[PDB]
Amino acid sequence: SEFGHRTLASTPALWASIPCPRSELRLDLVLPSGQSFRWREQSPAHWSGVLADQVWTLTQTEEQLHCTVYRSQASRPTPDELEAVRKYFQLDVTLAQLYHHWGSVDSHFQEVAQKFQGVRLLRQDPIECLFSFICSSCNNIARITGMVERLCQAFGPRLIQLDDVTYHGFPSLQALAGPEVEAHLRKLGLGYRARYVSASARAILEEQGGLAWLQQLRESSYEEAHKALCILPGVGTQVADCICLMALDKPQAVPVDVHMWHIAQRDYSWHPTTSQAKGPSPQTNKELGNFFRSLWGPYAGWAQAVLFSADLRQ
DNA sequence: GGTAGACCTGGAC
DNA sequence: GTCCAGGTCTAC
Ligand SMILES: [Ca+2]
Ligand SMILES: [Ca+2]
């Protein structure tokens, strides 16, 4: 059918594949795992969301990642469009090589890895990432998802409508920094997060030199980037690490939340050796990130994603 | 320098 | 009805 969300069966000629075995990527273990909060499984095994300013639907078979895009006459995705998809999933980073290494250095990762293959990091937009995670504060993945889409519906560009879903592009800096945005976000249920969204939008635009400041962080060192990000209102150590890891190409960045504390304790009998505190605190959190980084290497943030994800299923 | 308490809320046990 | 989720900010 010409309407509604597509499916591999439904509209055969509208899809194009990207070679990709399930061992290198698993949508159901990545898309709803707290990295991006903008993907939904409309029909079973089919995920629809905004990717590179367009709406896509993705579904995978054992060796292929099937993609379809909604923009002109309907048609399969072009090689360039598909390239953007390959880019978003950083398919050039070989998950098999990373899992192997992590496995040989961490007997525990080995055990968990066997059952949770295909977990990788998405290369996200700094702006979308920065604001989505500002909303992470004392919040669960479902509530976060709700806030973010409401935020996008209210200040994001209208893209296309499939069934009763009107997809929106992520709001721009200028839009989020607009008069009365906070008040609006509060009526949307973001709570005290409304304030930080507005504050950070204005901060970047009226104090840091704008969008470029954020984007230039991809060329900066992990340390510089993380240091810079913490300046923004509502952006602490954890949020900045998420941004570094998920959007600034800092693969060693390890977000330390309660989840990783439970993992560190239960699975590694970890204890803080520096800080004198027995639980989560700025100094012990820093210490843990260094513990994982020392344990897994340069792509510790990635290894972190595999366990965080596995810890969510449970 | 290293804590405790304030800040919002929808789904839980 | 108290509890919990990918926290952060700041006053003592
Ligand atoms: Ca929490
Ligand atoms: Ca800050």
Where would I find the beta strands (DSSP E) of A205-273?
none
Interatomic CA–C1' length for residue A276 and nucleotide C12, angstroms: 20
Which of A239, A228, A223, A188 is CA-nearest to residue A204?
Answer: A228
Per-residue tokens: A184: 């609006």
* First-to-last C-alpha distance (Å) of chain A: 38
Per-residue tokens: A99: 């899992």
Task: Output the CA A284–ligand 2 centroid distance in Å.
Answer: 18
In sequence order, the 6+-apart residues with CB closer than 8 A to the CB of A217 are A126, A224, A225, A228, A229, A248
- Amino acid code (one letter) for A140: N
The radius of gyration of chain A from alpha carbons, rounded to an integer in Å, stands at: 20
In sequence order, the 6+-apart residues with CB closer than 8 A to the CB of A212 are none
Number of residues that this document lists for chain A: 314
Bridge-based pairing of strands A64-70 and A16-19 is: antiparallel
- What's the resolution in A? 2.6
Between CA A219 and CA A248 the distance in angstroms is 8
Per-residue tokens: A176: 């989020």
Task: Output the CA A237–ligand 1 centroid distance in Å.
Answer: 14
Where would I find the beta strands (DSSP E) of chain A?
16-19, 39-40, 47-51, 54-60, 64-70, 158-162, 165-168
What is the enclosing helix (H) or strand (E) of A6? none
- CA nearest to nucleotide B11 C1': residue: A143
Query: Which of A's residues 157-186 have CB atoms within 7 A of nucleic strand C?
Result: none
Q: Helix, strand, or coil here: A274?
A: coil
Q: In what order do the strands lie in the sheet with A39-40?
A: A16-19, A64-70, A54-60, A47-51, A39-40
Ligand nearest to the CA of A259: 1
Between CA A151 and CA A172 the distance in angstroms is 11
Residues with CB under 7 A from strand B: A 138, 140, 142-143, 146, 186, 189, 191-192, 195, 275-277, 281-283
Between CA A129 and CA A121 the distance in angstroms is 13
Residue A158's beta-bridge partner residues?
A: A168
What is the 3-state secondary structure of A68-115?
A: EEECCCCCCCCHHHHHHHHHHCCCCCCHHHHHHHHHHHCHHHHHHHHH
The alpha carbon of A290 is separated from its chain's Cα centroid by a whole number of angstroms, namely 22
Between CA A133 and CA A136 the distance in angstroms is 5
Interatomic CA–C1' length for residue A5 and nucleotide C7, angstroms: 36
Q: Helix, strand, or coil here: A234?
A: coil
Check chain A for breaks (C–N over 2.5 Å) and list the residue before each, or none: 71
Domains observed in chain A: 1-89 (3.30.310.40), 93-113+254-314 (1.10.1670.10), 125-250 (1.10.340.30)
Interatomic CA–C1' length for residue A289 and nucleotide B5, angstroms: 26
**Torsion, CA A183, CA A185, CA A191, CA A193, rounded to 10:** -110
Contact A95, A25 (CB under 8 A): yes
